[PDB]
Amino acid sequence: MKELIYIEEPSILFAHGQKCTDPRDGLALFGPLNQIYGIKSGVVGTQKGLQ
Amino acid sequence: MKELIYIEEPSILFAHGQKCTDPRDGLALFGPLNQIYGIKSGVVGTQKGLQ
Protein backbone atom coordinates (compact mmCIF):
# COMPACT_ATOMS: atom_id res chain seq x y z
CA MET A 1 0.00 0.00 0.00
CA LYS A 2 1.41 3.35 -1.11
CA GLU A 3 1.10 6.42 1.09
CA LEU A 4 -0.94 9.27 -0.38
CA ILE A 5 0.52 12.35 1.32
CA TYR A 6 -1.74 15.36 1.93
CA ILE A 7 -1.12 18.90 0.69
CA GLU A 8 -3.17 21.28 2.82
CA GLU A 9 -5.32 23.61 0.77
CA PRO A 10 -3.84 27.13 0.76
CA SER A 11 -5.87 30.15 1.80
CA ILE A 12 -6.24 33.34 -0.24
CA LEU A 13 -6.31 36.84 1.21
CA PHE A 14 -9.40 39.04 1.16
CA ALA A 15 -10.57 42.35 2.61
CA HIS A 16 -9.20 43.39 6.03
CA GLY A 17 -6.34 40.89 5.71
CA GLN A 18 -8.60 37.89 6.32
CA LYS A 19 -7.88 34.55 4.66
CA CYS A 20 -10.37 32.06 3.23
CA THR A 21 -10.30 29.08 0.88
CA ASP A 22 -13.17 29.52 -1.59
CA PRO A 23 -13.41 32.85 -3.43
CA ARG A 24 -17.19 32.40 -3.42
CA ASP A 25 -17.08 32.56 0.40
CA GLY A 26 -14.20 34.95 1.03
CA LEU A 27 -15.78 37.54 -1.25
CA ALA A 28 -19.25 37.13 0.25
CA LEU A 29 -17.85 37.41 3.78
CA PHE A 30 -15.20 40.14 3.52
CA GLY A 31 -14.96 41.36 -0.08
CA PRO A 32 -12.18 42.18 -2.52
CA LEU A 33 -8.77 43.59 -1.63
CA ASN A 34 -8.69 46.98 -3.34
CA GLN A 35 -11.58 49.37 -3.80
CA ILE A 36 -12.68 50.70 -7.15
CA TYR A 37 -15.55 53.15 -7.05
CA GLY A 38 -17.62 51.53 -9.78
CA ILE A 39 -17.77 50.03 -13.24
CA LYS A 40 -18.83 52.23 -16.17
CA SER A 41 -19.85 49.42 -18.49
CA GLY A 42 -19.54 49.86 -22.24
CA VAL A 43 -21.64 47.60 -24.45
CA VAL A 44 -20.89 46.99 -28.13
CA GLY A 45 -23.78 44.96 -29.49
CA THR A 46 -27.23 44.99 -31.00
CA GLN A 47 -30.26 46.59 -29.37
CA LYS A 48 -31.47 43.16 -28.27
CA GLY A 49 -28.00 42.54 -26.89
CA LEU A 50 -28.16 45.77 -24.90
CA GLN A 51 -31.59 44.87 -23.53
CA MET B 1 -24.02 107.93 -29.72
CA LYS B 2 -24.46 104.39 -31.03
CA GLU B 3 -26.84 101.56 -30.23
CA LEU B 4 -25.24 98.80 -28.16
CA ILE B 5 -27.16 95.56 -28.58
CA TYR B 6 -27.56 93.37 -25.51
CA ILE B 7 -27.09 89.61 -25.80
CA GLU B 8 -28.77 87.68 -22.99
CA GLU B 9 -26.43 85.42 -21.06
CA PRO B 10 -26.79 81.79 -22.17
CA SER B 11 -27.58 79.15 -19.59
CA ILE B 12 -25.35 76.10 -19.17
CA LEU B 13 -27.27 73.03 -18.04
CA PHE B 14 -26.40 71.05 -14.92
CA ALA B 15 -27.69 68.04 -13.00
CA HIS B 16 -31.45 67.44 -12.77
CA GLY B 17 -32.04 69.76 -15.73
CA GLN B 18 -31.38 73.00 -13.85
CA LYS B 19 -29.64 75.77 -15.78
CA CYS B 20 -27.42 78.43 -14.21
CA THR B 21 -25.22 81.13 -15.71
CA ASP B 22 -22.18 80.52 -13.49
CA PRO B 23 -20.55 77.09 -14.00
CA ARG B 24 -19.17 77.06 -10.45
CA ASP B 25 -22.44 77.90 -8.70
CA GLY B 26 -24.36 75.51 -10.93
CA LEU B 27 -21.87 72.80 -10.04
CA ALA B 28 -22.20 73.54 -6.32
CA LEU B 29 -26.01 73.64 -6.20
CA PHE B 30 -26.80 70.97 -8.81
CA GLY B 31 -23.66 69.14 -9.91
CA PRO B 32 -22.40 67.64 -13.16
CA LEU B 33 -24.49 65.70 -15.65
CA ASN B 34 -23.01 62.20 -15.79
CA GLN B 35 -22.28 60.27 -12.60
CA ILE B 36 -18.86 58.73 -12.95
CA TYR B 37 -18.40 56.64 -9.84
CA GLY B 38 -14.91 57.84 -8.98
CA ILE B 39 -11.46 58.83 -10.15
CA LYS B 40 -8.80 56.12 -9.93
CA SER B 41 -6.03 58.68 -9.78
CA GLY B 42 -2.69 57.91 -11.38
CA VAL B 43 0.42 59.83 -10.34
CA VAL B 44 3.72 59.81 -12.21
CA GLY B 45 6.42 61.58 -10.27
CA THR B 46 8.86 61.64 -7.39
CA GLN B 47 8.20 60.82 -3.74
CA LYS B 48 7.77 64.49 -2.83
CA GLY B 49 5.54 64.83 -5.88
CA LEU B 50 3.29 62.04 -4.67
CA GLN B 51 3.25 63.59 -1.19
Side-chain angles (χ1 to χ4, degrees), chain B residues 19-34:
Chain B
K19 45 180 50 212
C20 163
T21 75
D22 209 343
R24 325 189 210 69
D25 289 290
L27 275 180
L29 313 183
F30 323 99
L33 284 312
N34 67 324

Side-chain angles (χ1 to χ4, degrees), chain A:
Chain A
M1 268 186 154
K2 293 83 171 170
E3 182 165 310
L4 291 181
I5 324 192
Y6 191 84
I7 288 294
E8 83 296 323
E9 157 84 347
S11 283
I12 41 186
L13 257 53
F14 277 99
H16 321 121
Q18 287 328 287
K19 301 165 204 74
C20 169
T21 45
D22 197 338
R24 282 99 56 78
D25 281 12
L27 277 183
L29 285 176
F30 321 125
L33 279 316
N34 82 320
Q35 99 266 29
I36 62 177
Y37 308 108
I39 316 173
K40 297 191 68 64
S41 42
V43 170
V44 181
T46 61
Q47 199 68 44
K48 188 187 282 162
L50 170 87
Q51 254 42 71

